[PDB]
């Protein structure tokens, strides 16, 4: 009755039926289901390599079929740059992917800003291009103590000349002569004929923008396939026929889980409804198909005579069984509590629905 008074923002309430709140069954527990991967991902062998590739011939390492701990990377003090796109590095530690690709190379400090989506310049255009919709993290650090030499380390090079910009993830290692004018080269360097690759001046005494930096770009892809990479995972047992919170392979939500009669084909991991929500999943360990339905909810209506007659009320829980609610009568309108059902019939006073009415007697 107090909730009715507050809903109506009045200290006096007229005879009638009022919706005052919505009920919702809460999750009894939280379950987590990740893939059963025993090996850890080889990130150490990517970042602690003795030698790194040039930017014109960047190196690609594929990471798969493993568990990944990003907590060692993001919380590291050794990195000068750690920029993520489309994802938070602190939340990356409980996500799953179909593949992760680590692209590694060495550039000068001033060129680091070019390692980002939508950027242009000598590196972005002619050496290493990322897509505008890139998802992943760019990690870089100064390597002046490792990749520089007193007389200069001309072992690292970059592309200076090209006919057109590279498409995303392209790699061009051609060494043929570029003709800059209208007269041809004969494979011979000379006027308007230049070798496309230039060396970097890598000396330990060079300024910050000129010193070498080691770069690793982590590209994350999530295709519709059994995830081969998942962050630190703690898995729990599977619970059914009760309202639970769940996380299936990075997919979070709440609802009741049951065995499904849906005939999934072996390549299918989940289904979707017209609302673009997931309504069925494959358990990543047992490969069982489960139905997902959210937990019972609905309106709560308070039935009252005027407060000028009585402070007694009855409550209707719309659309539910009386058994799920925690003078109890099950109507087609829902569960009615606080009213006495009788076999007599009278003119309708306060309408409940489906032929049922209530009154104060």
């Amino acid at each position, epitope marked *: 009755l107090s909730e009715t008074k507050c809903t109506l923002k009045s200290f006096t309430v007229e005879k009638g039926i009022y919706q005052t709140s919505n009920f919702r069954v809460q999750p009894t527990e939280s379950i987590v289901r990740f893939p059963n991967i025993t090996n*850890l991902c*080889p990130f*150490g062998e990517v970042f*602690n*390599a*003795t*030698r790194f590739a040039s930017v014109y011939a960047w190196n690609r390492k594929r990471i798969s079929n493993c568990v990944a701990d990003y907590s060692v990377l993001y919380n590291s003090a050794s990195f000068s740059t750690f920029k993520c796109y489309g994802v938070c590095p602190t939340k990356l530690n409980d996500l799953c992917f179909t593949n992760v690709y680590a692209d590694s190379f060495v550039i000068r400090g001033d060129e680091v800003r070019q390692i980002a989506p939508g950027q242009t310049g000598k590196i972005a255009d002619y050496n290493y291009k990322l897509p505008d919709d890139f998802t992943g993290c760019v990690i870089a650090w100064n390597s002046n103590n490792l990749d520089s030499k007193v007389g200069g380390n001309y072992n690292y090079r970059y592309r200076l000349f090209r006919k057109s910009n590279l498409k995303p993830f392209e790699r061009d290692i051609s060494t043929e002569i570029y003709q800059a004018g209208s007269t041809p080269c004969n494979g011979v360097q000379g006027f308007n004929c230049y070798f496309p690759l230039q060396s970097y001046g890598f000396q330990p005494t060079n300024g910050v923008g000129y010193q070498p930096y080691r770069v690793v770009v982590l590209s994350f892809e999530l295709l519709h396939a059994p995830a081969t990479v998942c962050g630190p995972k703690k898995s729990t047992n599977l619970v059914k026929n009760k309202c639970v919170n769940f996380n299936f392979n990075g997919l979070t939500g709440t609802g009741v889980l049951t065995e499904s009669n849906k005939k999934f084909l072996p390549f299918q991991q989940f289904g979707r409804d017209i609302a673009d929500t997931t309504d069925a999943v494959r358990d990543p360990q047992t490969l069982e198909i489960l139905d997902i339905t959210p937990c019972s909810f609905g309106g709560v209506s308070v039935i009252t005579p005027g407060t000028n007659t009585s402070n007694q009320v009855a409550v209707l829980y719309q659309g539910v069984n009386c058994t799920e609610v925690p003078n109890v009568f099950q109507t087609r309108a829902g569960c009615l509590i606080g009213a006495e059902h009788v076999n007599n019939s009278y003119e309708c006073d306060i309408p409940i629905g489906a032929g049922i009415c209530a009154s104060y007697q």
Partner: antibody
Framework: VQLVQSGAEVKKPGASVKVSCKAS????????ISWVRQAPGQGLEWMGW????????NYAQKFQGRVTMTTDTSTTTGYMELRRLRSDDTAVYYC????????????????????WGQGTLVTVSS | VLTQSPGTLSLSPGERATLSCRAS???????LAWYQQKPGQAPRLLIY???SRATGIPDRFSGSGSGTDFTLTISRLEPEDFAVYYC????????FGGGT
């Protein structure tokens, strides 16, 4: 992290010895296994390296055709077998955790032999 | 090939120690390491990557170098620092020095 090995053994010339290396306290498949020999009063001599992830191996030129390395990933244990034993093979055989080469890609790394075992003494006397 | 000098370094406790290792060919600083072996014990890693300290190693130990000349130093010898030291490289194949 702890690595342990088999006890001392005595062999006759022409025979073979298999030395175990049980390891724990780390993700076994993330690190390779290295083997080093040391004869009495001598310095350290490298024998070879094995990947615990994929079974890939590399051997020193003096042990090629003489040494075979194997790994059991279910018991987190490495093994090394030396064939055609000679009297000058009398030495302590050490097993260590490797970070000089990657287990997955097989590329050189910034590191060394991080954790060593007790060493297995092998004597080759008729 | 790695060579070390002096073969035996004679110093009193409390003194500063310097040990040298040289290479027949240029060795990348990323591919060099130093080890210590006490009497009756297996070797332990002290320095990796030429200049990086290994876990559990006290501030007494340090090192540096490039090209074909690398050095291990001890700022002050404690009774536990009297041991045989070895230099290693894995830039080409894998080899150890003769020890000091």
């Amino acid at each position: 992290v702890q690595l342990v090995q088999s006890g001392a053994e005595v062999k006759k010339p022409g025979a073979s010895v298999k030395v175990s290396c049980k390891a724990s306290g780390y993700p076994f498949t993330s690190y390779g296994i290295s083997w080093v020999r040391q004869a009495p009063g001598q310095g350290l001599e490298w024998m070879g390296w094995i990947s615990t992830y994929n079974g890939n191996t590399n051997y020193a030129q003096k042990f090629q055709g003489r040494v075979t390395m194997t790994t059991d990933t279910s018991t987190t244990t490495g093994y090394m077998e030396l064939r055609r034993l000679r009297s000058d093979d009398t030495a302590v055989y050490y097993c260590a955790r490797d970070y000089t080469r990657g287990a997955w890609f097989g590329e050189s790394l910034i590191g060394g032999f991080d954790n060593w075992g007790q060493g297995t003494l092998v004597t080759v006397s008729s | 090939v790695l060579t070390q000098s002096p073969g035996t370094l004679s110093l009193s406790p409390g003194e500063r120690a310097t040990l040298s290792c040289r290479a027949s060919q240029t060795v990348s600083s990323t591919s060099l390491a130093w080890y210590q072996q006490k009497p009756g014990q297996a070797p332990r890693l002290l320095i990796y990557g030429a200049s990086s300290r290994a876990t559990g190693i006290p501030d007494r130990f340090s090192g540096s170098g490039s090209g074909t000349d690398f050095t291990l130093t001890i700022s002050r010898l404690e009774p536990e620092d009297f041991a045989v030291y070895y230099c290693q490289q894995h830039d080409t194949s894998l080899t150890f020095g003769g020890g000091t």
